[model samples]
Target: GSMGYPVIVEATRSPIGKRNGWLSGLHATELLGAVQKAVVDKAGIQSGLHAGDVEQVIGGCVTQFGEQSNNISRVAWLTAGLPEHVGATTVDCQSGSGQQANHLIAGLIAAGAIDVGIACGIEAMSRVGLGANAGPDRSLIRAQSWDIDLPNQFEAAERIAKRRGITREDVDVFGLESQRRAQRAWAEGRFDREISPIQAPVLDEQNQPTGERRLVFRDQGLRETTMAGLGELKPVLEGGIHTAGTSSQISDGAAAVLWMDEAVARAHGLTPRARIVAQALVGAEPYYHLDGPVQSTAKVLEKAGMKIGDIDIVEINEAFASVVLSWARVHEPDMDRVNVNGGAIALGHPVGCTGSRLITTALHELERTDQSLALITMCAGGALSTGTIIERI
Candidate 1:
């Protein structure tokens, strides 16, 4: 009874697609709308919650211009033909944007401001590439008074690798393992229950839709990677340890979760898959941005009155091999329990979508294994990390 409000009744995600791949033929709104409708439909069947019942739509994306701009959440909701009275908003917490959406919407439910809400996220890297909206100036950044130089993500990853004593070989090994695990998971149908296939449009030679549709049901980034193959690749940055092999892939996808107040859920006769236990967002030095997850994880554990050992599953975004490896070194966990189905290093990280995607994956993993506790964490740009702990209800 101590745990109250903001229970998750539904979680689902589109298969992560590589840039310029199957999902690229569709626009951001199309991708976002499809996932939103699909999740609501799934929840309605299980909980009697329809699209019109959702009080608000809160979505996250890193780039918010061009096709993804003008408060994309509202645009997507309307595009999906949902109720007009329902409000919608968009958020950007950089890489953690999707997870941030989940936390924010759950907060509203917990505070009694909203009875039902959808926390969703989408990123179409193939359409609106990263840094498309980045400004030319650094004046605003310099004003932050950061002592250390704020290198770009790749450079920061290199810094983390050097500092953490993570080697080129070590990262390559981890990358190969990620591929192996992801392939095994797919073979075992581990992701089948949570993946919501989207009927993406088929494009012609002229880049126009051909009025045909194709089902995207499987992740497109999985490959039989080997350490020998990964070893031959050169570093992305000079004198750096990271390579395309050891870094998260550029991809496009969307994910969504349905959150309802516990009493509201009970009133509707909806069974919750998990209850939101605690959430935390913390900051670290900009130069060491990838390590923020370490702090965020600790904060969430403390808030939940739990410890690392209590978690049955953990989903830490593998933006870089060093990021996860360094985090493991500091706050150790059973290596087998972490990212058991692989992570961004193999399945691809769809930036904004990955947060909710992790939650979806985590919840399903918990139920699949008859486990109870799961922790989700991600390292975001701008030196931030967000963590959320949920227990199977």
Candidate 2:
């Protein structure tokens, strides 16, 4: 029997650790461990459900080449003291890794392969190098015959901004708004519900956990970004709208959403945090990479027999201010309902973990607002869009 959309009974994420300088040595597993514990602690899950009942574990990460090469989901499970017998899979869908893992979790539950499954994602830029952080993929670029350097998704955002007549001022304004919202969020403790406080091992000259507690839930990417400061920043690419100020931060974080059938949830007496109402994944031309959110959202809404107006909350990963604003303009998304808590620009877009992070944030915010429905979306490499609908239960 299909469980309809797999319900997310619980979810959590470690506080995103900052990258660069002294924080460069933090490991991905450290963050993963924090979130897993936080989920159990916050959700107050009962122990009656055996680890054997967990069935399968699936996870995603963009850079899994070096230290993270060994199976991450399995590693996280064992490290978390979960049952070893549980099956697991790892996926790489560019920065859309989280959404890909969720799709797998949904398929497994629908196929009756598992009564309970975990889909998690992590992106520890702190541990991984920049260009090398992405783990090197060839397909991301156009054919060599075209004599092209692979255009990153950010470049596509630049192109779209120019096409849409979105000025540098527009991006700077959006960036400022993001920083303001994020600052407000931190001050008001708006993220307390979604953030899983973590203690990352502060390392010395040697890569060793100092054993001293380090608070990790606060957003470090958020600085006093003003429109003037942003406009003063030089674009990374020639004529590009993406400056470090307007683009997503290189950060480290992880998140997870637990999925299971309605029967399983009922039997366990688990209260649903958010029920997966529907989801869609679509691809657009690589040149127009950042356009996926509106398309995927429209598709998911159409398939669910709903309208844009029906969505009460939206979380579109702001890989760049231009991308979010451009998508919003094209889709005419209700400004009030979309990203009320700010987005990646302020919160720090932890690439591989962002998709699931957005979903988790949206679900929790929906709960907080007593809103019925939310649309979570992400734009990624290969011009792909990942969209999911979560209904607060």
Candidate 3:
């Protein structure tokens, strides 16, 4: 059963654009539809696949309001001019939405439910904004009988930094390193394999399309940052260590992964790039919301019967500089192997898009370096984290 687990046949993503940047003009469905179509086209070209052959398309996007409502997954599928017979489902699990979509697809394959499916994620942050679906109501959260006080992501980042004794300079240094690594990755063309250039509209001053478009092929958040420059930035909270530079920037993007049954893939003359070895969804202490990634990583590694050293690459979403720093303190893996091409601090975080983006990014990196295994994990709200271990075939 394990040997026949679903494998990734192909993965692709639009370049991450910062808020109101290159991809800001596209709606959530438009961006996601384009990515979904791209993934199918790639698979079709490579393995004689058919657009209508896919059994399902599951997508994730947070802030499901306005342009993202009414189950945008199905809308995006139709928007892409794909076959109507192929069912689609859209889910929201905060930042891990896409990866959860991925997990569900793998579970479906393992259950002998289907042979082929698409897992994707998108967040048109500029258009919808964060928490766009939430009303100004605290009754639900206030009803929870938790002992510790719950903090928002920003405050939690500082609290975690305080707990970990991560100084301002340490975070600033990490922030600068993120930019450096991202710039280097771009210069080295490390992301060419995973990224699909998007033709996004150029928005006028009123946020309307200007009748002209540009091909966006690069992440908009990358910058030539330095530690001194990061040091000068003010903390989000007075006397806190975390700053805007260290926190994940609001971003817009979409990504898709083509998962197929290993046998079916081979039957179609498609080479499986990687097998999903294990996936874990775990929760941690709610007070320190970002702590979940560390626990999730351990849980997934345990589930896979592997050690940290066995992982050739690690793609831990950098929701904040201190998040990854705390994880490093817990499990001392080769830091060089972690986020080898930088992370959200430099590439921007499109919330829902990040989960599958990490998957696609890691898969490409694994193939590029001829590596065998990679672990991708991210901490989201509610102190929850999602983890997945993939072994390249």
Candidate 4:
């Protein structure tokens, strides 16, 4: 039972690359345009819609400075030589920017404002590092009545672990499991269906483009590690359970989902893979920022008139090991169903790109497992969380 208007015809992503890895040299605009073009090309083959048929292209990028600035969605679309007539817009809602873009596109489609669109995200952290251009606004900070120190992600991870009685060992075990699961998934080809390989340019010692190119077809972050190895690592925050081992990797990647009105999809002979049933964005106490998913999950389920038991798959972004571990403590979901193929810990988390990455993973996993419903949620900066429920069509 879907809301019907917004259905996903295709979903795909580039393999996650570690900071300064294979994709590091590529600019955000180039990477984003490649993914956007890939999605449209794949979907058009199935749906009979050319690039010009799309009404708009909405995308997300967090650090909107340098190469990523000045309406990145539009830049990417035109850079890829997509139709000039197709309008574009870029959005930033911190880490959840990608998911927010999808929600906005879906809403517009449902409202009859558009017939087809692409909801996509991109982040080239290697090209432009996080917080490079974002400085704190002291005036806004002073206006808050609360005296709490605004928590960065590290601080938030520490607070969640402390408040929930989650220990270093617990997070370490979670990290170990993530690596194992992702390795197994890759071995079994679980990721093959979702990947759209990118041909990245090769550079020589002089930082000039070489005649050679490389195909980035695999995630670059997977590594072998044991619980004991993880235990030996130092904490990122003093006396905190979080460590580099337990936190999401800083990486570069992009993903996209093509959404169309059901009638339009059917008319074009497109078979939708899933439908967006319910979506939510919720706020929680700023200091406990990562825990916003707990509230968001509850609210989204309520909106869908469903319960936790009804969700067959869950993709909670592993922003930090503590974030997922603490969420598990509150909801107690079936561990096997949550992040079945692994998450950011082993796969890498590319800030603005992860929201749609999670969605792409969930949709494919649901089909693989023959499951009906899947839930995707992630914590954002400023104590915000975004959640979405999608059902296989």
In order of appearance, the predictions have TM-scores of 0.95, 0.91, 0.97, 0.95
Q: Looking at model 1, report the run of 10 residues with the lowest lDDT sum.
A: 138-147
Residue-wise lDDT of candidate 3 within 290-385, one digit each (tens)? 878889999999999999999999999999999999999998989999999999999999988999999999999999899999999999987889
Query: Higher TM-score: candidate 1 or 3?
Result: 3
In model 2, pairs of residues that clash are none
Candidate 4 has its poorest 10 consecutive residues by lDDT at 134-143
- lDDT per residue for candidate 2 within 32-149, as digits (tens), equals 6456545655545563555556678777787775646687767776777766788877777777788778878988888877778877887778776446644258556445567433
lDDT of each: 0.90, 0.75, 0.90, 0.88
lDDT preference between candidates 2 and 3, better one: 3
TM-score of 1: 0.95
lDDT (tens digit, per residue) of candidate 1 on 147-203: 666678998898898888999999998898899989999999999999999989877
Score residue 82 of candidate 4 by CA lDDT.
90
TM-score result, candidate 3? 0.97
Candidate 4 structure lDDT: 0.88
In model 4, how many backbone clashes occur?
0
Give me the runs in candidate 2 sitting further than 4 Å from their true place: 1-5, 21-25, 45-47, 50-52, 133-150, 204-211
After superposition on all C-alphas, the RMSD of every candidate to the true structure, in Å, is 2.2, 2.8, 1.7, 2.4
Say which prediction, candidate 3 or candidate 4, comes out ahead on TM-score: 3
